[PDB]
Design a protein around this ligand. Structure first.
Ligand SMILES: NC(=O)c1nn(CC(=O)N2CCS[C@H]2C(=O)Nc2cccc(Br)n2)c2ncccc12
Length: 228
């Protein structure tokens, strides 16, 4: 998270850290007792390595009572997801067992009505992604409040030149933005999950290249299908 603040410990109990060989890769969001929603291309180049989902965390390294690790029993990517496109950038991870729920571990209600978040709405994006262009990896959870950007502006040739479909959404990226590692992380508006940070490589912190987030409501039927 570029231009953010360290988040209040365990204030976002839905926050998950998708890790490979005990190293953070992507953010994730607890949507059910045994399901974590993330971005499609997070497990890319993972291959030979231990994939695990860290729950109840604030510091990635320090001991915390709430901190628990889960094996991934099943990894369900969206059927139409491909590394060449930023489209259908969703991944549903089934944990080995149901999450031990508590004040620091709680699933987030996600948007089940396909209606765009009104431009200018302030949304909260959190994660353990890089905090500066050099690439500083933060130990503790960071977060930033960003206003939702009008798709028309976002699709300008100077911006994402039409790449932003009706299934995607934008947020402002003027210094304060999401970045490498924030992928698969949640975009929350009015305490409801609205978007999922894309896992597609992009330029961060430049205002003319807005942050891209997958609209969960746009994939509500698929998510329901998998979870059931
Ligand atoms: N949404 C983004 O801004 C974004 N996502 N990605 C993809 C992305 O972050 N990922 C997809 C493969 S696993 C994950 C990734 O590269 N994670 C990572 C790498 C180094 C440090 C940290 Br903390 N996290 C970007 N890559 C480069 C620049 C920006 C991004």
């Amino acid at each position: 998270i570029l231009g953010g603040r360290e988040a209040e410990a365990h204030a976002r109990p839905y926050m998950a850290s998708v890790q490979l060989n005990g190293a953070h890769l992507c953010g994730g969001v607890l949507v059910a007792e045994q399901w974590v929603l993330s971005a499609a291309h997070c497990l890319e180049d993972a291959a030979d390595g231990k994939v695990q989902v860290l729950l109840g965390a604030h510091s990635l390294s320090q001991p915390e009572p709430s901190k628990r690790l889960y094996d991934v029993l099943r990894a369900v990517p969206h059927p139409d997801s491909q590394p060449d496109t930023i489209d259908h950038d969703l991944l549903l991870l089934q944990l080995s067992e149901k999450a031990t729920l508590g004040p620091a571990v709680r699933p987030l209600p996600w948007q089940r009505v396909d209606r765009d978040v009104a431009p200018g709405t302030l949304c909260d994006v959190a994660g353990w992604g890089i905090v500066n262009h050099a690439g500083r990896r933060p130990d503790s959870l960071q977060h930033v409040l960003l206003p939702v950007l009008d798709r028309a502006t976002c699709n300008r040739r100077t911006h994402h030149d039409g790449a932003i479909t009706e299934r995607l959404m934008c947020a402002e990226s003027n210094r304060r933005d999401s970045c490498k590692g924030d992928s698969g992380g949640p975009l929350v508006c009015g305490g409801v999950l609205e978007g999922v940070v894309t896992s597609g490589s992009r330029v961060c912190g430049n205002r003319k290249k807005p942050g891209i987030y997958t609209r969960v409501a746009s994939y509500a039927a698929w998510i329901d299908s998998v979870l059931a």
